Design a protein around this ligand. Structure first.
Ligand SMILES: Nc1ncnc2c1ncn2[C@@H]1O[C@H](COP(=O)(O)OP(=O)(O)OP(O)(O)=S)[C@@H](O)[C@H]1O
Ligand SMILES: Nc1ncnc2c1ncn2[C@@H]1O[C@H](COP(=O)(O)OP(=O)(O)OP(O)(O)=S)[C@@H](O)[C@H]1O
Ligand SMILES: Nc1ncnc2c1ncn2[C@@H]1O[C@H](COP(=O)(O)OP(=O)(O)OP(O)(O)=S)[C@@H](O)[C@H]1O
Ligand SMILES: Nc1ncnc2c1ncn2[C@@H]1O[C@H](COP(=O)(O)OP(=O)(O)OP(O)(O)=S)[C@@H](O)[C@H]1O
Ligand SMILES: Nc1ncnc2c1ncn2[C@@H]1O[C@H](COP(=O)(O)OP(=O)(O)OP(O)(O)=S)[C@@H](O)[C@H]1O
Lengths: 621, 506, 239, 114
């Protein structure tokens, strides 16, 4: 009875309906049985990746024995689950562990082969000593104890394959991961056990989406494991909502409460600066109360005139996970995506041929039309200097993430020599900086939804292009650790300066001179930016002045520009060779120098408004 | 009763009101709850950068459990905070750690799903007690069944160094990503945490102070993350102000200790039988008197202020930001605006002529202290060139003296040794896997500490026409990245390039 | 051969009916092995160094399940020391790894794709091959096949393949299309140029159908369970 | 099996001495066979009251171990290694293996029913 102290009973647990069903996997169970029923060395070892189902095969075999679907050489057996962790528990004195183990082995041998021992994670058997897990080879090599095991694919190589005298006595059984139409059947079989735990209903249309979506978005994990999690979390969220109240009313009231709490502490401030921050908090609180009222009133109509996890809760889960937006354009996002070349036109003036092509690749990716295994867009735009090609890449990343510092930006002027490729792919094993990974790789692996800006790409060595050759057109890049990273949701952008004034082909026959055809073929549109007309500069002036005024609001200080000066600046924005950068320096020289000379010689304080006007030649404040 | 031995209790502390408030972050707490209340594999793991607030989310969950804002599945759950360091305390024998872990696990299991574990910094669980690979993965069967719940929190790169190596155990956890909030969220956080500090230090904290902290520490301190480098400023400012309420204020406490030292030195210089020290003594006395003058002046002015500074303001935060990362971020407190108006006549003491360049440098230095210049760009990027022996390096050496009072405080690099292409690896460092890699860049490491110098590229035209390309980012904004992948900011420097093209033509 | 012709596609197609799964082949991109020391990346590091237990990358995937298909993309972009390992992989059938084990390749199917020459009629490509590789390396391979180039007749069927693929993709919402024969002829004649292969066709299908479809789809009026026809205008084609 | 319940300070060595004296009392008949003998290096906390018996020609000690464990647990104790005559066993060829299978077929025929 030394088995009862250090072991559970799988067959007993299976007879009480405490195990989950096992669907399919016939070849593996048959091979396990036919290895378990031979004369000598009859002990298999299930081996594979983590999450593919290897404990589930042993549980299915236990259920099959209980039912009676095994050959006569294996009926009425019991599958005992040995546990080496509780045999080492109290073994201070120098014979306790060896004595316990010998007692258990003798209990297994005193039977008539009517016991099947099951050690799970048996890479934990080579230690246990301090001569332990090594006093088992005699019985192993003869078939006295029938040992079903299970380890992953590289704990075997790491712990057991080091002891080649021991791993001679195991018969590897390779368990590979199933496919999508197998995971669907597994989910159909397992559904009725989650439907009862979370008292909801789960739709077959959701079971299919849970296997389809989790196969293209969640790549660091394996099958069924990564498809049951979506169903479980969807059910749990739906039960939370079936309780007290739904979502997006819970957020609105929870935010209005905090807004009110802060407004009831901002009113009692004896400050002149803090008096204008109270005038916007109130406005926002009112706007939030309005939305709360609307949603709460519509909830009443919905409740008078969302009870099962459909195929959209799965997408909501897989979008909270991984950050990638995979929804159905819930009526507040489509109105925004339909006005995009007008939200980009608030920062980049002109260049409609390039604004109407970046926004054209986000629509056909939110609408589910684009190729599912390629980056969402990989295109290179190039033109003269100071034109706005690095500004479009920063104005696009500004409204997708609401923060333009949330994009992966690498400057290719530092990749002059070819051995600088290791900077973004990592070092191979055995060398100095290795347990740190790549630099481009380890950034697109934590948040696989950014935009990637390769800036000044033709300043690099013509081999970093070859490294980029697979990132485009396939969306995959492997680092030193042997991890594949998927660039399938990023928006790659490559800015350049070739040609530099050439009309259309002198700038196009210069690309074809530095880049190879296999590289120019992976790209989408090659967008040629254009010079800046004098008419599309009087608006850049307004943008610059608005930025300056917003920069001065920290000091409670405004300034009123009159149209003669506002178009004097535009007329001295000149030389269609340096773009719109001379205007930035002109605004400084004209306004800022004398403004900051007055600002610290008295003569100007907070709250003032400083009118600027056009003296016959210069500007005077 | 083994839990009582090897674990603290978090819900108890939340009930006794010993936990700080938790403001915002409803999405993260909701996701933590809905992962904590599923059938199998209900183990969430908060993950992110150091400082964004991850333990804060768990303490918020505990307070929310105590209050009652949790769904029906999580009422009265009594969070427990395990401690593996005290479980390996004395276990020198063969099974002392295994039996403690078995006892704790059985105690957690004997409850009908009430206890919620919490192992902070769970990367310390991998090799818990080793000698072989046996321990730290005894919880591996209970994790998959969902019998212990095990909320945990690690950083973003201590996770792939210790856990992602063990993909059999990384499977049992669900990753919850916590990114750093914005400035408008840090302000709301500060507005709610501004009572514990007001009580600890017996002072009062203005709201403009909170806004100024959240704004300044986002552009000046770029090594840390937001919700924390903004609380540090408020804490240090309040502690300084409380230290000053002890009767003496600052700038009298230093002058007193200075005059004392001067007196001790003068009292010991008097008995010197020499002649070389009879001229050094006649200067220390003048210094002592000229300091006693201003000491008495301050002592008298304090009396006026006291008879005829109780709250932290938007300039004590700037004082802290200037004391740490010595960039001056104050508000031109009347002792230096005169100097800043006199700059041109003060530089004209060492460089004679070249008014067009002295004025063009002085304007750029002046309109940066008045808050007019672009916040994300270097404070100035000049290239002045002319014939030889004229003064274009003397001006760069005089500006550094005017600004830092030590000509050896600027970062000078001599661009005449960058003749060949491969010399660029000198100022940017070597990529991973090559010889000099731990040293990093030289310009990069020189500006990464003390990011307020003057940078001087002497004789820029004598280098290879490929070193000019690594400057396209340093000139348009302040970023330059070394081989380790960390970006340094050149937004507070003055870059100067001297050259001699077209020697004396026109 | 030239670019965009089907030499990376034939590997994914051959490995799709041997194992019934297109992701069941060992694929490594040789444009990242540009230096000497990156050979240790596919063979493993010697014992006692930083990355030791991780083993090799080409080795550890064939040592278990040694019946796969191995693909080496852009083999010319590698360093002329990676070829000196495939040397013993060929003509003997096995190489050793960092530990000392000898995994055997006697059951795999090696495939190496390249773009050498790309403008040579029929002989300049062989000249570039003979100048870039060693004769004792070219000697071990089987036939050095040479792809040819797409004809205006071998492109209408590719149009059909691409349209079937697009339909299969947007069939997850019951949104089948209805293409006319003049439409297919327009799509086949428009994008053809015989220097960029068959990727211009993909880009043209996108820009011509997908843009209009996605502009109409998120503005209502193209609701699910619907079949829109595509037909030709004077220049463009309208839905 | 010798190391079990031997938790007291004078038990395992006493057992081993009893066994060795029982072997030596028999003149030269008993021939000890220790399988995987690279495990006799530890077993104490001992297992080393065998160098004398080996010097005095009393023990027989026919043993079998694998190749690498030999040099990893024994050749670090050259005091022992000298007392051991090595025999090398190589793996057979296909013909010898067919010969072996022909002789072993009978027992697998009767264990199963085929
Ligand atoms: N064939 C199957 N039929 C039913 N459920 C399955 C099947 N395969 C896997 N599962 C379920 O999917 C999950 C996979 O868990 P396990 O099979 O226990 O993982 P594993 O095979 O033990 O891998 P490791 O290395 O032990 S984590 C469990 O919830 C199983 O119940
Ligand atoms: N079309 C434009 N609309 C608004 N601002 C513009 C525009 N073009 C240039 N600018 C301004 O020009 C400055 C930087 O322009 P960039 O786009 O960064 O120059 P660039 O296009 O990158 O050219 P190069 O070759 O990189 S120097 C910013 O202050 C922008 O506001
Ligand atoms: N939402 C929040 N509400 C209130 N205080 C917060 C919030 N987020 C962060 N804090 C505070 O900001 C600081 C962040 O500390 P922690 O969150 O404990 O650090 P951490 O996230 O655990 O980082 P490490 O790597 O674990 S040291 C603490 O002083 C918290 O009280
Ligand atoms: N305007 C000036 N005022 C005072 N001293 C000056 C002036 N111009 C030159 N000098 C003196 O000349 C010395 C050398 O002049 P530098 O400016 O260092 O030479 P430079 O201007 O760098 O010309 P090159 O091209 O580098 S040789 C300085 O150390 C001063 O002593
Ligand atoms: N014969 C073909 N039949 C069908 N599709 C083809 C054919 N040739 C090319 N394609 C398409 O071309 C794309 C892939 O072309 P690839 O053959 O992978 O390019 P490649 O042959 O590798 O040439 P490089 O050197 O890699 S640019 C896919 O969209 C294929 O559908």
């Amino acid at each position: 009875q030394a088995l009862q102290k250090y072991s559970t009973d799988l067959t007993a647990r299976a007879r009480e309906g405490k195990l989950d069903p096992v669907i399919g996997r016939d070849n593996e169970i048959r091979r396990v049985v036919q290895v378990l029923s031979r004369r000598t060395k009859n002990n298999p070892v299930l081996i594979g990746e983590p999450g593919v189902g290897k404990t589930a095969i042993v549980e299915g075999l236990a259920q099959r024995i209980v039912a009676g679907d095994v050959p006569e050489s294996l009926r009425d057996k019991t599958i005992v689950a040995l546990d080496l962790g509780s045999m080492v528990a109290g073994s201070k004195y120098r014979g306790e562990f060896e004595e316990r183990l010998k007692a258990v082995l003798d209990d297994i041998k005193n039977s008539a082969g009517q016991i099947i021992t099951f050690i799970d994670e048996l890479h934990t058997i080579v230690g246990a000593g301090a001569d332990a897990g090594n006093m088992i080879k005699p019985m192993l090599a003869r078939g006295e104890l029938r040992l079903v095991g299970a380890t992953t694919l590289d704990e075997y190589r790491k712990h057991i394959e080091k002891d080649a005298a021991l791993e001679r006595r195991f018969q590897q059984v390779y368990v590979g991961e199933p496919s999508v139409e197998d995971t669907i059947g597994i989910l159909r079989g397992l559904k009725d056990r989650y439907e009862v735990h979370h008292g909801v209903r789960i739709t077959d249309s959701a079971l299919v989406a849970a296997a389809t979506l989790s196969d293209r978005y969640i790549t660091a994990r394996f099958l069924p494991d990564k498809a049951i999690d979506l169903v479980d979390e969807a059910a749990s969220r739906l039960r939370m909502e079936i309780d007290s109240r739904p979502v997006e009313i819970d957020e609105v009231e929870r935010l209005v409460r905090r807004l009110e709490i802060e407004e009831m502490a901002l009113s009692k401030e004896e400050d002149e600066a803090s008096a204008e921050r109270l005038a916007k908090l109130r406005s926002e609180l009112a706007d939030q109360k309005e939305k709360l009222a609307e949603l709460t009133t519509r909830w009443q109509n919905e409740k008078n005139a969302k009870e099962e996890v459909g195929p959209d809760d799965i997408a909501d889960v897989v979008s909270a996970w991984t950050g990638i937006p995979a929804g159905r354009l819930l009526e507040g996002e489509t109105a925004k995506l339909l006005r995009m070349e007008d939200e980009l036109g608030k920062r980049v003036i002109g260049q409609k041929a390039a604004v109407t092509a970046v926004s054209d690749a986000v629509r056909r990716s939110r609408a589910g039309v684009s190729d599912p295994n390629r980056p969402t867009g990989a295109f290179m735009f190039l033109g003269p200097t100071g034109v706005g090609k690095t500004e479009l890449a920063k104005a696009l990343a500004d409204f997708l993430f609401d923060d333009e510092r949330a994009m992966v930006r690498i400057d290719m002027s530092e990749y002059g020599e070819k051995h600088t490729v290791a900077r973004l792919i990592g070092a191979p094993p055995g060398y100095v900086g290795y347990e740190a990974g790549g630099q481009l790789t380890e950034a697109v692996r934590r948040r696989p939804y950014t935009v990637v800006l390769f800036d000044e790409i033709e300043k690099a060595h013509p081999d970093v292009f070859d490294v980029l050759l697979q990132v485009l057109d396939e969306g995959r890049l492997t680092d030193g650790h042997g991890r594949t990273v998927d660039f399938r949701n990023t928006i790659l952008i490559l800015t350049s300066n070739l040609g530099s004034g050439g009309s259309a082909e002198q700038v196009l026959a210069a690309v074809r001179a530095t880049f190879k055809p296999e590289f120019i073929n992976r790209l989408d549109d090659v967008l040629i930016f254009e010079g800046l007309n004098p008419e599309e500069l009087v608006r850049i002036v307004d943008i610059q002045l608005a930025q300056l005024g917003k920069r001065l609001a920290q000091r409670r200080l405004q300034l009123q520009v009159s149209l003669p000066a506002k178009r004097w600046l535009a007329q001295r924005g000149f030389d269609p060779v340096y773009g719109a950068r001379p205007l930035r320096r002109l605004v400084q020289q004209a306004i800022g120098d004398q403004l900051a000379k007055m600002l610290l010689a008295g003569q100007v304080h907070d709250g003032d408004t400083v009118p600027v006007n056009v003296s016959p030649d210069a500007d005077s404040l | 009763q083994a839990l009582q031995k090897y674990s603290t209790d978090l819900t108890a502390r939340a009930r006794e009101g010993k936990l700080d408030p938790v403001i915002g972050r409803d999405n993260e707490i909701r996701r933590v709850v809905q992962v904590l209340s599923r059938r199998t594999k209900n183990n969430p793991v908060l993950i992110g950068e150091p400082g964004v607030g991850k333990t804060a989310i768990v303490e918020g969950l505990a307070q929310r459990i105590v209050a009652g804002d949790v769904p029906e599945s999580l009422r009265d759950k009594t969070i427990v905070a395990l401690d593996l360091g005290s479980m390996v305390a004395g276990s020198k024998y063969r099974g002392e750690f295994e039996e403690r872990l078995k006892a704790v696990l059985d105690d957690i299991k004997n409850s009908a799903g009430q206890i919620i574990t919490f192992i902070d910094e769970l990367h310390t669980i991998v090799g818990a007690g080793a000698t072989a690979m046996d321990a730290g993965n005894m919880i591996k069967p209970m994790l998959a069944r969902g019998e212990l719940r095990l909320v945990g929190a690690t950083t973003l790169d201590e996770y792939r160094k210790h856990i992602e190596k063990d993909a059999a155990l990384e499977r049992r956890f669900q990753q919850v990503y916590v990114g750093e909030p914005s400035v408008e969220d840090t302000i709301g956080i500060l507005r709610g945490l501004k009572d514990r500090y007001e009580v600890h230090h017996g002072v009062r904290i203005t709201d403009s102070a909170l806004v100024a902290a959240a704004t300044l520490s986002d552009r000046y301190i770029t090594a840390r993350f937001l919700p924390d480098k903004a609380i540090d400023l408020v804490d240090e400012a309040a502690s300084r102000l409380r230290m000053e309420i002890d009767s003496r204020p600052v700038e009298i406490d230093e002058v007193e200790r200075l005059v004392r030292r001067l007196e001790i030195e003068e009292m010991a210089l008097s008995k010197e039988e020499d002649e070389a020290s009879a001229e050094r003594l006649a200067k220390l006395r003048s210094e002592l008197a000229d300091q006693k003058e201003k000491l008495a002046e301050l002592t008298t002015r304090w009396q006026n202020e006291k008879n005829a500074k109780e709250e932290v303001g938007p300039d004590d935060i700037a004082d802290v930001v200037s004391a740490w990362t010595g960039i001056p971020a104050g508000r031109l407190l009347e002792g230096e605006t005169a100097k800043l108006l006199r700059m041109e006549d003060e530089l004209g003491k060492r460089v004679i002529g070249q008014k067009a360049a002295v004025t063009a440098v002085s304007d750029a230095v002046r309109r940066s202290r008045a808050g007019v210049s672009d916040p994300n760009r270097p404070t100035g990027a000049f290239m002045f060139l002319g014939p030889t022996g004229v003064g274009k390096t003397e001006l760069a050496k005089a500006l550094a003296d005017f600004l830092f009072d030590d000509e050896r405080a600027m970062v000078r690099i001599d661009m005449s040794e960058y003749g060949e292409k491969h010399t660029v690896a000198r100022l940017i460092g070597a990529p991973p896997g090559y010889v000099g890699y731990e040293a990093g860049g030289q310009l990069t490491e020189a500006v990464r500490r003390r990011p307020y110098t003057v940078v001087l590229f002497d004789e820029i035209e004598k280098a290879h026409p490929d070193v000019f390309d690594v400057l396209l980012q340093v000139l348009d904004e302040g970023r330059l990245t070394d081989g380790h992948g960390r970006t340094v900011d050149f937004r507070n420097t003055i870059l100067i390039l001297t050259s001699n093209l077209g020697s004396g033509g026109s």
